[PDB]
Design a protein around this ligand. Structure first.
Ligand SMILES: [K+]
Ligand SMILES: [K+]
Ligand SMILES: [K+]
Ligand SMILES: [K+]
Ligand SMILES: [K+]
Ligand SMILES: [K+]
Ligand SMILES: [K+]
Ligand SMILES: [K+]
Ligand SMILES: [K+]
Ligand SMILES: [K+]
Ligand SMILES: [K+]
Ligand SMILES: [Mg+2]
Ligand SMILES: [Mg+2]
Ligand SMILES: [Mg+2]
Ligand SMILES: [Mg+2]
Ligand SMILES: [Mg+2]
Ligand SMILES: [Mg+2]
Ligand SMILES: [Mg+2]
Ligand SMILES: [Mg+2]
Ligand SMILES: [Mg+2]
Ligand SMILES: [Mg+2]
Ligand SMILES: [Mg+2]
Ligand SMILES: [Mg+2]
Ligand SMILES: [Mg+2]
Ligand SMILES: [Mg+2]
Ligand SMILES: [Mg+2]
Ligand SMILES: [Mg+2]
Ligand SMILES: [Mg+2]
Ligand SMILES: [Mg+2]
Ligand SMILES: [Mg+2]
Ligand SMILES: [Mg+2]
Ligand SMILES: [Mg+2]
Ligand SMILES: [Mg+2]
Ligand SMILES: [Mg+2]
Ligand SMILES: [Mg+2]
Ligand SMILES: [Mg+2]
Ligand SMILES: [Mg+2]
Ligand SMILES: [Mg+2]
Ligand SMILES: [Mg+2]
Ligand SMILES: [Mg+2]
Ligand SMILES: [Mg+2]
Ligand SMILES: [Mg+2]
Ligand SMILES: [Mg+2]
Ligand SMILES: [Mg+2]
Ligand SMILES: [Mg+2]
Ligand SMILES: [Mg+2]
Ligand SMILES: [Mg+2]
Ligand SMILES: [Mg+2]
Ligand SMILES: [Mg+2]
Ligand SMILES: [Mg+2]
Ligand SMILES: [Mg+2]
Ligand SMILES: [Mg+2]
Ligand SMILES: [Mg+2]
Ligand SMILES: [Mg+2]
Ligand SMILES: [Zn+2]
Lengths: 150, 141, 25, 129, 98
RNA sequence: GUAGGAUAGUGGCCUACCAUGGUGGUGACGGGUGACGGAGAAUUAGGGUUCGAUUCCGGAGAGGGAGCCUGAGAAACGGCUACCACAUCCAAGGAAGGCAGCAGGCGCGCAAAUUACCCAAUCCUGACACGGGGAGGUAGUGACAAUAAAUAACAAUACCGGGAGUCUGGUAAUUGGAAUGAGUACAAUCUAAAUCCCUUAACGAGGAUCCAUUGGAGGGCAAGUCUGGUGCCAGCAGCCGCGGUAAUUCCAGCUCCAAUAGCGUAAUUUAAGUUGUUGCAGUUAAAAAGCUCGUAGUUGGACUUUGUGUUACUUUGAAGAAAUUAGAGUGCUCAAAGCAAGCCUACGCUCUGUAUACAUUAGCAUGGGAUAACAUUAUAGGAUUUCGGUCCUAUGGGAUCGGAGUAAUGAUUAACAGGGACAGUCGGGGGCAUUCGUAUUUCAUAGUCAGAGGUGAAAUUCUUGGAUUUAUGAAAGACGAACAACUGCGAAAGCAUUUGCCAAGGAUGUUUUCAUUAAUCAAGAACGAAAGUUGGGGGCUCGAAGACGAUCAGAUACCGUCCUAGUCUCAACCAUAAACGAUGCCGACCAGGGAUCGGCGGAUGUUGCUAGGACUCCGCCGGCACCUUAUGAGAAAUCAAAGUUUUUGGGUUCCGGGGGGAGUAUGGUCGCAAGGCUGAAACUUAAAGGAA
């Protein structure tokens, strides 16, 4: 189930068996990749780029039209952020809890959740260093974490 | 449950090593406290009869078990040795050399005799069995 | 004897030893 | 987590067989499971099984015929040379006349009788009878 | 030997339940274990309704009722006969009696 | 590390100088061993447990250390020098000492033989065919251990059976003739010489006294409810028990039983699936850490050819001491053994035989490539030809920098794994501030008059100085009723008046994103009811301790009255609970049924309502539970998991091994303390315990 709770939820997306684009989808691969680069330069992340394409352009899966995932397209154009998106959001959450916790010393529930979030940061950072998606000497520092994110 | 991994050889071996100590039979032999027993790991032992004593049989029996306090010659420890058979205490005199043996339960008390774990086998170099059956006689008088 | 009170009796007995041993140090 | 997909597949079949079911679904599928089934199929312990493609791992529906007493994995997968096959059969099989231990050898997945004929050793996957 | 599947109380999926105080002796008892009875009766006993109704100063008046919620500990419920010891089979019957 | 010195020679082996390294939870370092290592030994269905001083191999020592000469070889001890420890002789000035060689003695002990003969065999050594050999062999002692094997056989009578009868079988210190080695002994043989054995003249059995023993006869456990004695004594009894005047159990006789030239008694294997890898347990019997995080460790979804990256694994082979083990051959009379022998009858033969297998792990070498581990991948420093430049170097090669080509140019999928984003929600989840509620207590005002309180009954206690009771109002602190449930939230502890703010979260929804990032976790961390500790605030109520009134034989209690700490709060500690589901976490599978909580999908017609909400019906996912049932499990109680277990193996952590002593002593560590964590032994005991 969940990494840091007893939850056993299974809700998730279910990809269709048809990997090809629908017959009613006329946009070509060069046009799609032009929009993906256009959104990345505006600051959007791979997760929220695909949401816009699905909701406003009828592109259910970018891979079906272009043959590559959104992050791969951004890397080919030098638009992949230095810190991966998912690791970035964990750091932002840890910063928020610490900022809240400095004014609330007796909020022991927050202190408990801060430990879980930071341990989740270190498990993900370890993986990214092994796959060389982070600098080899990159290290998460609570003192300077708030400067990275936000 | 049990650890099953093919690479878990160390944990299984070390786990058993720790758990064997929980076994009373294993711990009695590997503790080293057997050497501190009056026999100090020996099957028999010679000693000097200090006095002839009687011990009240444990309940629900009622009798006076004839024993003898013996000081072991090799280490000077004093023990109580039961004298078996009928009227064999008359064959034992104080300050006499007696061969002692275990009572049969490896240092545990036997029967209704309280706190007695030794018995007398020989007296003055002669077995009590031979004296009891009038095979031999004690060397004196 | 109730286990709780036997536990209480032993703790009292340990305090005296703790005090009867630190008396000479 | 899912550690041995083979154990889930064989455990599902064994439970289904005892309940007297005619079919049973195995998920996920693997080429080890398929080759294990083929060994059972050749000896007439299961009927026809069908692999369903779902673009992720696939699924298998196995037809049962009521001949399978038990089938299970051996974990961990111990090494078994040809000379030690006799000891394993004396442990896992009902008798010296039926029942097969499935091995993975460098020559492929096969039962212990075929392994003796080819004089090849390997590792134990499971057994059935 | 475990006597009841519920352990004598009604608690699932929670750690602690605050206690109440027995209406009879004041003993502390978890609210989910206490025997609760909600008594509703006329504020005037049936032996005095006729006399009070004859002395009424109003042409129409409904005598109010007395609402009292009683929460007993186990010892008081058994002693006061609010509940009785039941046989092993009858212990499982949870429906109120007739 | 560099340079030397020394050594037969490598090397911090040693010196000078320089550097700051080396080892460690994959257990260094230290401690224990009644520890020489191995070949092996015992027991072993398999796996295993225990042992290994001792004849083969290796090492080490010669009373303890050290030093050394001679020599090819020794840090030699049946060589020397010194010290220390023991000890011999002396004319007292000196001198000589090393049995853990053989025998022998003392001592120690439960515990172990002759101060014998010989170089004949085996082999070793010297100048040596010849000498020497306490190595070695021979004999003596020898119930360590092992092998074979006597203590009678037969017939006829008497007696007694079975298949009136008669064949067969059984008993007798009856009666008969036969057999024979134990013993004894001419002899020969044996042997280096003797001795024993083998062979053999004579001799050698009737109660064939040429006398079988050791333990038993209640049960376990084969064998007596026999007779005499004893009377809870004496004694027996491994365990259960026997014995108190009619003892199957003690002491005896008789009889019977077991093994038998043997048998009894006092570490270790088996039994023990009571150490469990194979293969055990942990709801209640002993045993899930209070809870979560977390490193090492251990374990990790699917996918790539079917029809000079590194390893594990598997196959075959090579190498491997003998002895032992297994095993082939062989009639030492058999046997344990031994390694011999066999064939015929010549001046001999079978080249006579003296096989073979096994031998963990590590190492070496072939074949196999499923399973599995590690490593690797997208600015290819890519593969592949071809055309140059430059440099170096032989009788072309190498290195390096470029051009132009060739090609399908080069990225598995998106787990009813996990993480992250997003969406509308949901909750008594947490923190901060804030609102309200009656009650209680106190006080104020007013009214009234004799009791009020409390108990089983009373009394302590309050009260005409106005108690209790009634109305109004104020203050204080606590608490948050009813609603409130086999309901919710939280990792657990725990969480319940309103509203706002702050961060967090599960589930659901999703054709969003990453792509194995995971599971469980030594070490190490966060949180952890109540009580308790330190200080400040507060101090209604209740209330350990204390005091008093009752009750009582007593009452340090239960009941009543008053009350301290405490109860509330802040800062800081403590880390324990029946912290319980007495049930660790992750994953798969395996019956039925209704209800309920959250989210979503579909259908439907009602609302004193503003598509939606409320309700009705169908379904999906997730959660707290309940009900029926066994095809399951279990000692059962009972459990839809405590099921899918002798048809035993999904992954992982913790933890138990009869009852006590004892969560005690001691050491360590944490704490202000209280204590927490870690945690024995001596000794004691035949039951304790679970379910029914
Ligand atoms: K979701
Ligand atoms: K083991
Ligand atoms: K109840
Ligand atoms: K050297
Ligand atoms: K050097
Ligand atoms: K020489
Ligand atoms: K010789
Ligand atoms: K010679
Ligand atoms: K077995
Ligand atoms: K703490
Ligand atoms: K449900
Ligand atoms: Mg799941
Ligand atoms: Mg985890
Ligand atoms: Mg399991
Ligand atoms: Mg009871
Ligand atoms: Mg819950
Ligand atoms: Mg609780
Ligand atoms: Mg040098
Ligand atoms: Mg130096
Ligand atoms: Mg040894
Ligand atoms: Mg030694
Ligand atoms: Mg040895
Ligand atoms: Mg020794
Ligand atoms: Mg010797
Ligand atoms: Mg030797
Ligand atoms: Mg030497
Ligand atoms: Mg000596
Ligand atoms: Mg020397
Ligand atoms: Mg000598
Ligand atoms: Mg010598
Ligand atoms: Mg001896
Ligand atoms: Mg005789
Ligand atoms: Mg008798
Ligand atoms: Mg019998
Ligand atoms: Mg008698
Ligand atoms: Mg007996
Ligand atoms: Mg045991
Ligand atoms: Mg057990
Ligand atoms: Mg208990
Ligand atoms: Mg228990
Ligand atoms: Mg795999
Ligand atoms: Mg997925
Ligand atoms: Mg609710
Ligand atoms: Mg309320
Ligand atoms: Mg720990
Ligand atoms: Mg606390
Ligand atoms: Mg505890
Ligand atoms: Mg517990
Ligand atoms: Mg755990
Ligand atoms: Mg628990
Ligand atoms: Mg619903
Ligand atoms: Mg049921
Ligand atoms: Mg098992
Ligand atoms: Mg125990
Ligand atoms: Zn009550």
């Amino acid at each position: 189930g969940r990494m840091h709770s007893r939850g056993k939820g299974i809700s998730a997306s279910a990809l269709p068996y048809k990997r090809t684009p629908p017959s009613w989808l006329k946009i070509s691969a060069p046009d799609v990749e032009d929009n993906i680069c256009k959104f990345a330069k505006k600051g959007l992340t791979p997760s929220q780029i695909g949401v816009i394409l699905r909701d406003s352009h009828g592109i259910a899966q970018v891979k079906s039209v272009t043959g590559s995932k959104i992050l791969r397209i951004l890397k080919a154009h030098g638009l992949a952020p230095e810190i991966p998106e998912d690791l970035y959001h964990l750091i932002k959450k840890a910063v928020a809890i610490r900022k809240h916790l400095e004014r609330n010393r007796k909020d022991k529930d927050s202190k408990f959740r801060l430990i879980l979030v930071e341990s989740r940061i270190h498990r993900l950072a370890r993986y990214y260093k092994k796959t060389k998606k982070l600098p080899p000497v990159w290290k998460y520092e609570s003192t300077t974490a708030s400067t990275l994110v936000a | 449950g049990k650890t099953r991994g093919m690479g878990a050889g160390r944990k299984l071996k070390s786990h058993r090593r720790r758990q064997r100590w929980a076994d009373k039979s294993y711990k009695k032999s590997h503790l080293g406290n057997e050497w501190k027993k009056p026999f100090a790991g020996s099957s028999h032992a010679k000693g000097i009869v200090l006095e002839k004593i009687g011990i009240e049989a444990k309940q629900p029996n009622s009798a006076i078990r004839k024993c003898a306090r013996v000081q072991l010659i090799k280490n000077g420890k004093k023990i109580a040795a039961f004298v078996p058979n009928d009227g064999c205490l008359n064959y034992i005199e104080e300050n006499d050399e007696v061969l002692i043996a275990g009572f049969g339960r490896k240092g545990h008390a036997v029967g209704d005799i309280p706190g007695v774990r030794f018995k007398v086998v020989k007296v003055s170099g002669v077995s009590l069995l031979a004296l009891f059956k009038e095979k031999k006689e004690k060397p004196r008088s | 004897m109730r286990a709780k009170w036997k536990k209480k009796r032993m703790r009292r007995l340990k305090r005296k030893r703790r005090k009867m041993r630190q008396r000479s140090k | 987590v899912r550690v041995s997909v083979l154990n889930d597949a064989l455990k599902s079949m064994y439970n289904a067989e005892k309940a007297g079911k005619a079919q049973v679904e195995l998920r996920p599928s693997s080429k080890v499971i398929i080759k294990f089934l083929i060994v059972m199929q050749k000896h007439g312990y299961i009927g026809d099984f069908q692999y369903v493609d779902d673009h992720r791992v696939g699924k298998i529906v196995v037809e049962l015929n009521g001949r399978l007493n038990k089938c299970g994995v051996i974990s961990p997968r111990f090494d078994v040379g040809v000379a030690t096959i006799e000891g394993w059969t004396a442990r896992l099989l009902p008798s010296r006349q039926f029942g097969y231990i499935v091995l993975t050898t460098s020559a492929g997945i096969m039962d212990h009788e075929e392994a003796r004929r080819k004089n090849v050793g390997g590792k134990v996957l499971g057994f059935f009878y | 030997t475990f006597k009841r599947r519920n352990g004598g109380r009604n608690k699932h999926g929670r750690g602690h339940v605050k206690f109440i105080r027995c209406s009879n002796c004041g003993k502390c008892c978890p609210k989910d274990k206490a025997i609760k009875r909600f008594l509703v009766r006329n504020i005037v006993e049936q032996a005095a309704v006729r006399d009070v109704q004859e002395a009424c100063a109003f042409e129409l008046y409904t005598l109010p009722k007395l609402y009292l919620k009683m929460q007993y500990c186990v010892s008081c419920a058994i002693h006061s006969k609010v509940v009785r010891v039941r046989s092993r089979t009858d212990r499982r019957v949870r429906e109120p009696p007739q």
